[PDB]
């Protein structure tokens, strides 16, 4: 029937989707050899008798994480050559992932999405998980995104990109990858959700009270967010909103499709014992700047669109009261031409818990996705940081000798600056 | 009832027939010592089509094994299912055909004629009515090509109103064992066009290549090479021993395929051939088989039908499966492969629901197809002939046993007159 297709590009896209697919198979209760001891139809295809196979592609040019999943616990969950591995990395470059080593792998991945989308009609969209910071994630990710944009023109693409952060980058050529990636990611994707790193790490410090988590807890939290976002697609509820009715609410102009998100409550076994979490206070914690996973303070921002999907037992009566409390709050600001900026979605099924994770199970939670004006300073920081190393040609000889031309750096300057001026002309 | 008479010819024919008698035997559920095991009416009610009684309930196949060297026949008594055949059904050659068509057909094979007729007529007239024959032989060597085509040149004019299907293993463009390639290939084929009812082309070079992507294994032995052939060997004649909603037999298969008497060379292929990694991950259904058997890359012959054009296609589906899902799904492949099919024949295909699935598999299909794509494989054999015949090379061994330069030039002239209809039926 009606289905959705996932794509994972880059190493960050790999084990983020590993955290996603373990949680999807945990929610449906399916034992991950395929057997169950029709709501799974959109994320899993039936194979034979009782077996279910994920509808996703794994894609990274090194085999160090692709063969890790292949030899790992889900060898019999993921189909073996749904996973595509290359031979050499993109070496933290847009250029290698887009020009030379991308040819040998996009022809196979295009064959895999044709075999995965021609099986049934009624496709909702695509779920691309990638990293802007990844050389393969931005390199091979952008070549994949533009090819699926021209071929699949009128289909939507939910994107989840690991944006670089102000303090850490864990790459010296990192802002070079960031400017060029959004140079073409602006015009080909339909919607992209922005996820920084130590905003989530500070989330794990503050309200999850753990002082040294790893990429485990970075990927558990991203898996909760996408699952509560797509919870209306698989599971039935009181007020269901689907993929095609997200851009109509959150995207007022086709230029602006970059936005923040947060999930509440972020609690452990110490908090579910001690604090009551009602509808009027979980939305206040969701609108707290501490829960922001892009470390952007919205007080000097301005909200313009928000979808408040609640997962778990809630009623329309008390969620409308919680909406009215946020509107009457003086510190939070809205834009004057959007009197209605809250589009609440309601599900019924309780949020799941991964056994062994720090999260304690909660049966009402808020995922909220919010287009605002505050994104401008996050990207203008990225523009200023790039300009210092573009002053006297830092790390440009790798790109030039690869096959791109000096001037694609400069064209990406006024396209990100056009995105800067677009943010400040809607913030008036 | 309807009797099919099987012949193993040459080293390749003996080895490929051994695997087919292994896959038929366990398809009918039969222990290799002769005793039936498996407890079903539906695999035992039609056993006389291929087999014979032995007044103990034992079943012996209607197969004669004929070969001019004792080497590879000693291997098939030594191997599994070697006790299944009749000892009289073997006929021996103690000399060994040394890759020469001349001692295959004229000189050394002449003294084995009076023994091979006495064993094929003994098996034929013992039944009430014969249906057809089915031989397996290769055009590469001498005891398969020359000693095998000598069988067609005699069995037809003594049993005129019958048919036979010859599964000819054809040589390679790239790899080359049996260094005297074009002489044995051409000398068998000009007889084979005139005097054989249909020919299935089987290509080793290509069937390594199915074994390298869709079955994708690194170490291909001759065992599973012949096992992939024996699937389409079995599927082309499955409804002779099995019931079905829409039936098919060999005589029908000839009537609605061959339009003109001088084209009877057929592609062959078996679907599904699913990779070992992909075994559990295919909820196998009719749409994905149809694209697999209308897939050029999955053809046992080393000819690409993108260049060619299917004159008539045929598909013997097998198993519990819907019948209109055969019908309008092939109307979809005509409407999408419009240029891949001949425009002066509408509805170019067979549909045939063999109601019995293959051995272990729920549902499958066996594709046989008259294609004009074989013209490129027939012309490279032609220029392989001419490149070595201008220099008169490798001719002294042939001429010493009663050949002629004259008889070689109607072999090439019948070769060119065989190719000739293919590019003007495009």
């Amino acid at each position: 029937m009606r289905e959705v297709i996932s794509i994972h590009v880059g190493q960050a896209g790999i084990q983020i989707g590993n955290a996603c697919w373990e949680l999807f198979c945990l929610e449906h209760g399916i034992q991950p050899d395929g057997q169950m001891p029709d709501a799974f139809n959109t994320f899993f295809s039936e194979t034979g008798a009782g077996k279910h196979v994920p509808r996703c592609v794994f894609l990274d040019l090194e085999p160090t994480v692709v063969d890790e999943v292949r030899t790992g616990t889900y060898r019999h969950l993921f189909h073996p050559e749904q996973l595509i591995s290359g031979k050499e990395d993109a070496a933290n470059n847009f250029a290698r992932g887009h020009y030379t080593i991308g040819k040998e792998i996009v022809d196979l991945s295009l064959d895999r999405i044709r075999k995965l989308a021609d099986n049934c009609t009624g496709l909702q969209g695509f779920l691309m998980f990638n990293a802007v910071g990844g050389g393969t994630g931005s390199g091979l990710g952008c070549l994949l995104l533009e090819r699926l944009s021209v071929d699949y023109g009128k289909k939507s693409k939910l994107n989840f990109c690991s944006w670089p952060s102000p303090q850490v980058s864990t790459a010296v050529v990192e802002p070079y990858n960031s400017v060029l990636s959004t140079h073409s990611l602006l015009e080909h994707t339909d919607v992209a959700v922005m996820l920084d790193n130590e905003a989530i790490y500070d989330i794990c410090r503050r309200n999850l009270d753990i002082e040294r988590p790893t990429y485990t807890n970075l990927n558990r939290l991203i898996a909760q967010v996408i699952s509560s976002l797509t919870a209306s697609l698989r599971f039935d509820g009181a007020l269901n909103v689907d993929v095609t009715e997200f851009q109509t609410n959150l995207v007022p102009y086709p230029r602006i499709h970059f936005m923040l998100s947060s999930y509440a409550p972020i609690i452990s076994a110490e908090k579910a014992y001690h604090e009551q979490l009602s509808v009027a206070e979980i939305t206040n914690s969701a609108f707290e700047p501490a829960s922001m996973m892009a470390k952007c303070d919205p007080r000097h921002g301005k909200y313009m669109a928000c979808c408040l999907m609640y997962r778990g037992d809630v009623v329309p009566k008390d969620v409308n009261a919680a909406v009215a409390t946020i509107k009457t709050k003086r510190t939070i600001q809205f834009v004057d031409w959007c009197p209605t900026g809250f589009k609440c979605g309601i599900n019924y099924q309780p949020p799941t818990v991964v056994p062994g994770g720090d999260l304690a199970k909660v049966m009402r939670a808020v995922c909220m996705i919010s287009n605002s004006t505050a994104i401008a300073e996050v990207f203008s920081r990225m523009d200023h940081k790039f300009d210092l190393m573009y002053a006297k040609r830092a790390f440009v000889h790798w790109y030039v000798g690869e096959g791109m031309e000096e001037g694609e750096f400069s064209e990406a300057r006024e396209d990100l600056a056009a995105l800067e001026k677009d943010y400040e002309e809607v913030g008036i | 009832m309807r009797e099919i008479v099987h012949v193993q010819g040459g080293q390749c024919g003996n080895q490929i027939g051994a695997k087919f008698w292994e896959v038929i035997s366990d398809e009918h559920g039969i222990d290799p010592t002769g005793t039936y095991c498996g407890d079903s009416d539906l695999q035992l009610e039609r056993i006389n089509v291929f087999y014979n009684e032995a007044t103990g309930g034992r079943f012996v196949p209607r197969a004669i094994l004929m070969d001019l060297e004792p080497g590879t026949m000693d291997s098939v008594r030594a191997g599994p299912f070697g006790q299944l055949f009749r000892p009289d059904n073997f006929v021996f050659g103690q000399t060994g055909a040394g890759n020469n068509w001349a001692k295959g057909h004229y000189t050394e094979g002449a003294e084995l004629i009076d023994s091979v007729l006495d064993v094929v007529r003994k098996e034929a007239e013992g039944c009430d009515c014969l249906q057809g024959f089915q031989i397996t032989h290769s055009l590469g060597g001498g005891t398969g090509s020359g000693m095998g085509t000598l069988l067609i040149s005699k069995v037809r004019e003594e049993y005129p109103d019958r048919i036979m299907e010859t599964f000819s293993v054809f040589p390679s463009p790239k790899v080359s064992d049996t260094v005297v390639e074009p002489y044995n290939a051409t000398l068998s084929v000009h007889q084979l066009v005139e005097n054989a009812d249909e020919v299935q082309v089987i290509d080793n070079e290509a069937l390594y290549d199915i074994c390298f992507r869709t079955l994708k294994l690194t170490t291909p032995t001759y065992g599973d090479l012949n096992h992939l052939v024996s699937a389409a060997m079995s599927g082309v004649t499955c409804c002779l021993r099995f019931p079905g909603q829409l039936n098919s037999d060999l005589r029908k298969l000839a009537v609605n395929l061959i339009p003109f008497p001088r084209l009877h060379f057929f592609l062959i292929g078996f679907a599904p051939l699913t990779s070992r990694g992909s075994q559990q991950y295919r909820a196998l259904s009719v749409p994905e088989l149809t694209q697999q058997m209308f897939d050029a890359k999955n053809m046992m012959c080393a000819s690409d039908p993108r260049h060619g054009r299917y004159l008539t296609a045929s598909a013997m589906f097998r198993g519990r499966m819907s019948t209109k899902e055969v019908d309008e799904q092939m109307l979809n492949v005509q409407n999408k492969n419009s240029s891949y099919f001949v425009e002066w024949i509408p509805n170019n295909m067979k549909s045939s629901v063999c109601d019995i699935p293959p051995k272990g598999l729920k549902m499958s299909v066996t594709f046989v197809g008259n294609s004009t794509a074989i013209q490129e494989m027939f012309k490279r054999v032609s220029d392989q002939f001419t490149a070595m015949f201008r220099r008169k090379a490798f001719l002294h061994w042939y001429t010493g046993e009663g050949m002629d330069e004259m008889e070689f030039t109607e072999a090439e002239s019948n070769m060119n007159d065989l190719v000739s209809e293919y590019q003007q039926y495009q």
């Binding site: 085999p63 063969d67 030899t71 073996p80 | 294994l217 170490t219 070992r276």
Partner: peptide
């Protein structure tokens, strides 16, 4: 071309394991 033991990941390692263990 160098061919190695089936317990290393080079070319198609997945079913250098399953039909013919070494």
């Amino acid at each position: 071309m160098a061919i190695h033991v089936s317990r290393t990941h080079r070319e198609d390692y997945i079913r250098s394991l399953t039909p013919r263990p070494a």
